[model samples]
Target: TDPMVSKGEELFTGVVPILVELDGDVNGHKFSVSGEGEGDATYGKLTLKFICTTGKLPVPWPTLVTTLVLCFSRYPDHMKQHDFFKSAMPEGYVQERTIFFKDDGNYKTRAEVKFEGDTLVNRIELKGIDFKEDGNILGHKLEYNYNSHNVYIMADKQKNGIKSNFKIRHNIEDGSVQLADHYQQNTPIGDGPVLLPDNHYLSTQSKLSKDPNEKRDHMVLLEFVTAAGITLGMDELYK
Candidate 1:
C-alpha cells in the first residue's frame, strides 16, 4: 500500500502558499517567500535558493520546486495562482496532461506539458520515477525571451534581435531545474507595471509612491519570480 508513499503524501497537503516556506539541504532547495503573500504585506521577504544535488524525487521536492516555480511564472493568473497554467492559447503547439489532485483523490500526480508559441516556450516532461543517475535520465530545459513589446527578457546581451538569454539549464548534478543559478531581477528589464484590463496592475498597493518619480514598486520578471519563486505575485485587494 505504498503507491509511491500515498503519492508522496498527497504532494504535501495544501501544496504551499500559506506564506510559502520550504527549506532543505545537500546544497539546495530553499524557497522562503513571505507573509500576506496570498495578497500583500509591505513586500519584502523573498529568499529563493536552489543550488544542486537533489534527486530520487517524483513529486514532493517541495512539489517539484513548486511546479517549476509555477512554470517560471509566466503568470497570467496561473488559474488563481496555480491551478496550473489552464491552457488553450492556440498558435503553434499545445500538448497537455497536468493533474495533481486534492479533495480525496486517493493519490494522484501528473505532468507532461508542451506548449510552444502563444505564450512562447514551455516543455515540461515530468511524471514518475526517472531521476536516475546510474541509468542517466534526469533532464531539464526551460528558456524564454521576449521583448519588442512582448516584454519578458533575460540577458547576457545581444542587441536588436536579442539572440539567446537562456533562463534555465538544469542537470547540475541532477537537481534538474535550476533557473540559471541565482538570477535576480526586481525590475528594469521591460521597465514594469502595466497589465490591467482586470488581470490587475496598472499599479496598486495604495497606488504606491514615496516619489522617486512615482516609483511603481518595481518587481518585474514576472513579479520577481512570482513574488520570489512562485505564488502571490499580486491581486486580492486592489480596487
Candidate 2:
C-alpha cells in the first residue's frame, strides 16, 4: 500500500508509546511535535523535538539502521578487504613506491608493495586515466616500509608527470594527512628534485625546481601502522 504522511506521523509518534517501551527511565524526558508559524502551509514547517535526561538515552534508531545498511551494502568489499589484510599481515611489513600522473587532467599511475619477514612481499601497480575530462586523478597509493610502519601516500603530477611539485602525507590519526612540506626547487631551473621525510619514511627526487607548472618528477615512499600495531604486508598493497 502507498504510505501517507499521516501514517508516517503515526509511526513516529508511536515509536515509544508506553513508558515500559523505553529501556530506561523516561522521567524528565519529553517528546513533542511542533509546527511553526500561523502562515500558509507552504511557509509552515514541522519539527520533531526530543528532550532527554542527561547522560542517558537510547541510540537513535534511524542512525542504527543507517549504520547497518552501510556496513552491509555500501562497502562490503572494502570491509572484507580490511579484515583480510589485517589477518594477512599479523607480524607487520614494509612497503615503498613511485607514482606518476598528469595534471590539468585526470590520469594517475602507481607502483607500490609490501614486505614481510625476509622474503615474502606483495606488489601492486596500476595505471588509470580519469574518465571525466575535468576530473582530477585519484592519487591513492599505499606504501609500506621498514622504517615506517604503513603509510598511505597520494601523488599528483603534471604533463611532465613527476616533474611538478610533489607532496608527502602522513596519516597520523583517523583523518586525512596534510602535506607538511613540499620540494619544488630543481636544478636546470625546473628539472631536479628533492626528498621529504615523514617520520622514518622518505620520498626522494633526483632534483628540485622553482617552476609552478613543473610536474612532480620524483618518487614517493610511505609506511603506515594498523590498529593491531602490525604493519601492512606485501599482500596488503592496493592497486
Candidate 3:
C-alpha cells in the first residue's frame, strides 16, 4: 500500500482538487498551508505555500502525501514519468535522486520508483513510531479490517488500561476521507478524529505532510479558469 505507488490506478485516472487550506500544530509546532490548481480542467499548473505566522514555529509536519495530487492529476503525461513521483515528496525532502518507500501490509507509507512503470507496496508493521508513547501507532497490536468505505483498525497502545487509536475519519458519518483518526484520543499539538478533507473529486486527502497537526485544513482548491485565459472563480469542498 505505498501511498503513492499503490494509488497509481486511482492517480492514473487523475484528481480534481479545488483548494487546500491546512493549518494546525503537531509535536508542538504550528503550520499553515494553502494550494491552488488554477488552470482550466484541461490545463496544467498548481501551487502550495506553507507558512508559520508565529515566527519560530516549526514548519508543517512531514508527509508522504502532498496537495499536488490535483496538480499531478492535471498533468497526465507527467504521471507517466518517474520524476513526477520523486517531486511528490515533502517540500523540504531534498534527498537522493528520488525515493519513495515501498508499502505493504496493513499500512500505506511510501514507495521508491526505480524505473518507468515500476510499482511498489507498503507493509504495515508495529513500529509506526513518533506517533505513540510505546511508539506504536496501533498500540500493543493492530486489529485491521478492510471494508468497502474505509480501512478499519484499532489502536491498542493500552496506556491507561485500554487506549483508543486516533482516526482521521473524525465524523465517521461524513465518510469523506479514506484514512482518518482522532489524533490519539487527546495528544497535544493535535488530537481527535482530525482528518484531512475528502470531497466530491477525490476520496484521498492529498496532503503534503507526514506529521499530523491540530489546525490542518485538508483538501485542495480548484480554480475554474476560463479557456480564454481569464480567472473566473475558485472551487472548494463543501465538507
Candidate 4:
C-alpha cells in the first residue's frame, strides 16, 4: 500500500509523460477515438494523436483541437471526465483541479469558457455538459469558445476565434465522447461529432504558482506550459 502511494506520488509529481487510451475503433463495430494522449507537466512539451477508428481524424481532430484553444484542463492523475474544472465542494471529486482559459497571446487568439454542472436535485453538479450513453443522445448545457467566436464581430484579419456551446455526448457504443451542433449555427471551428475520450480528460501537473502558492493572474506567463500536458494531447508519445 505504501509503495502504491509512493508510486502514485511519483507519477503525479514527476516530469515523465504518461499515456492512456480512453477510446478506440477497429471497424464498423464501435467508435474509434482510439486516440492516444501524453503529458509531462514539468517541462513544456505536449502531444495528442487523433484517429478515425482505423483510418484517422473522424468525429474529428480539428474540431477537438479548437475546443482546447485556451484551456487549462488539469487534475490529479486518474481523475475522470465530468469532474475537473472546479475547486472544492464534492470532496470525492477533488481530482478536478482546473480547466483554465487564458487570453494573453499565449494562444493565437483569446478564448472564453462557461462551465455548467449536472441537474437533478441530487445531481450535485456532476460536470454538467451533455452526453450520450449506450446509443441515444443524453443531456446538454456545456460551453467553450475561442477568439473568433467573440460575441462582437471580429475584424482583425490576424485574429481568429472558435466557439463550442455543447456537451461531450459520450456514447457507450464507442469510447470517444460524442459531439454535435445543437446550436442553429455550428461552431466556427470544424464541427466534428467525435472526441478523444477526455470526459474531455486531463492529467496532474501540480499547482501552477508564481511567488505565492496561490496565483490568479490570468495574463501570467508559463500558464500555458503547465497546461501543455493536457492541451498538447498525446503528441509527446507520438512525435
Candidate 5:
C-alpha cells in the first residue's frame, strides 16, 4: 500500500535544475533538492511548488494557490510579504508554473516569475496539491530574501535560516497564524494567532545538500494542520 519505492525511482530520474545522483538505498527512499534554485535576485520574492502524483488522485492546484495567497495576505507590510515570495521560489526564470509527472515515472517541476518595473515584486509561486480519496491537503509557500539570507514560509508564519535548521508553526485555524521558532517563540514576520504548542499538528523536515556548483544551500520543511481545533500528536501518523 506504500508507494515509496515507485516514488523514489521517479524522483531520482526526474528533471531538476541541478544534477542529482542517488546514493544509499532506494528501499528506504529519500528525496532531496540541491543546486541554486532557479530564481536568485539580490532582492526579490520567489515561490516553490511541489506536486504529487500517486494512485488515481488528482492534483489540487486551485486549493493550493488559494491557501498560499490567503496566507501571504495576512502580512501587515507589503514589503515583508514581497520578501517572503522571493525567498520561497527557485532560482531561475520559471516560464510557466506547473509540475508534470509522466507515466514513465519521470517528473518535472517549474515556476513562473512576476516582476514590476525595476523592482522584482514576485519571483515564482510554487504549489503542491495532491489528490487522494481521503481528501487531505499537502502544500507549501515560500518567500525568498537573498540579501537577508532568509526564506519565509508564509503559510506557517515562520522562516528558515540560510545556514541553520529551524522550526516554524502553521495554524489550522481559518484566519492567519503567527510565525515561530523551534521552541515556538513568536516572531514579527507574519500576522495572526500564535499557533500554540497544543495546536501543534504535523512537522517534517527534509535536508538538502548545498549546491556544490552554485554554493547556495537549501532545505525544505513541510508541516500540516487541521481545522476544528484538532491538534496533532507525535504518534498520529503511526496510528
Candidate 6:
C-alpha cells in the first residue's frame, strides 16, 4: 500500500504541514503530510507509509479522507501529455508520464502517445488502489462504493470517533457533479449538509509538494482544457 517503493535504497524522509486557503475562506485548513519517495531521471517512487491522526497536531479525519479520495480519483492524469505556454504549462522541459501499478503488480510497460496542444495527436490504448479493502489509509476501515453515477467514501472520524460519510454524485440530467458529506448518524439527507463547488475535486494541476510553502490555485481556464482528458484517463483505469 506504500506509494514509495524503497527496498532498494534510502533517499530521504520529510514531513510537510501546509495551510491551504481554499478561496481565501476566513478559516484556513492545515494538512500535515508525511511521506517518502525516491526520484531520478529514469524512475521514481513514493509511499505514504501511513496517515496519522494521533500526532501532536490532529489532522481532521474528513479532510484527510477527502484529500486521499480526490487525489486517487485523478491518479491517471499523470499519463496525459501536456503542451507548452498554454493557460498553464510545466515549469521546465516537460516529459512526464505516470503508469499506475499494473494488475500483475509489475510496472514494466508502456502505451504512449502524442499530443498537439490538448488534442491527442495519435491513437493507442490501456484497480485501481482499493481504499476500502486495503484499509491502509489511516489503518481504519474505509468505504469506497460507486454506482453508475456516484462515488461514496465513508470513514471513521479519528478525531471525534464519529462516522464521516462523503458522497459524490454525477448528475446526468444536468451534467453537474455534486458533493455532500455529513455524519451517517446525523443524517436525514436534509439537515445542514454541506455542498461543495462543482469542481471541488482535485485535478492534475494540484501538486501536494514536499514544501508546505508551495501555494496552488485551481485555475478554471486550465481545468477547462485538461479536465476532460484527465477524466478520460481515469475512466480508462477502471475499464
What lDDT is obtained when candidate 3 is compared to the true structure? 0.25
Please report the TM-score between candidate 5 and the true structure: 0.19
- Between prediction 1 and prediction 2, the one with superior TM-score is 1
- Give the winner by TM-score: 2 or 4: 4
Candidate 6 lDDT tens digits, 1-239: 22221210111122111111111010122233332221121121122222332232221122222222111122222421211111111111111112222121111111112223322211111101212222222232222222222223222223211122334331222343323232221111122212121212222222222234424211111101122233555578899
lDDT of 2 at 238: 58
TM-score of each candidate structure, all chains considered together: 0.21, 0.18, 0.24, 0.26, 0.19, 0.21
Which residue runs does candidate 6 get wrong by more than 4 Å? 1-31, 38-46, 50-62, 66-239
Worst 10 residues of 4 by lDDT: 119-128
The parts of candidate 2 lying over 4 Å away from their true place are: 1-117, 127-130, 138-216, 228-239
Candidate 4 per-residue lDDT, tens place, 56-90, comes to 32222222333221222333333322221121111
Candidate 1: what lDDT? 0.23
Write the residue-wise lDDT of candidate 3 on 1-239 in tens digits: 33543343343233333333434343333444443333222343333333333443232122312212222323222222222222232221111111111121122222121212222111111112233322122121221211212211222233211112323321122332234332212111112121121111212222233124534433332222111111122222332
**True-structure Cα RMSD, model 5:** 20.4
What lDDT would each prediction earn against the true structure? 0.23, 0.21, 0.25, 0.24, 0.24, 0.21
Task: Report clash pairs, candidate 1.
Answer: none
Please write out the lDDT profile of model 1 over residues 82-181, one tens digit for every residue.
2122211111112222322211111112222222322222223333321222222122122122111111222212221111112322233434333322
Measured on C-alpha atoms, candidate 5 has an lDDT of: 0.24
Please give the distance, in angstroms, between residue 226's alpha carbon in candidate 4 and its true position after superposition.
Answer: 3.9
The global Cα lDDT (0 to 1) of model 4 is 0.24
- Displacement of residue 191 (Cα, Å) in model 2 is 48
Instruction: Let me know the TM-score candidate 1 reaches against the reference structure.
Output: 0.21
Residue 187 shift from truth in candidate 1, angstroms: 28
Worst 10 residues of 6 by lDDT: 83-92
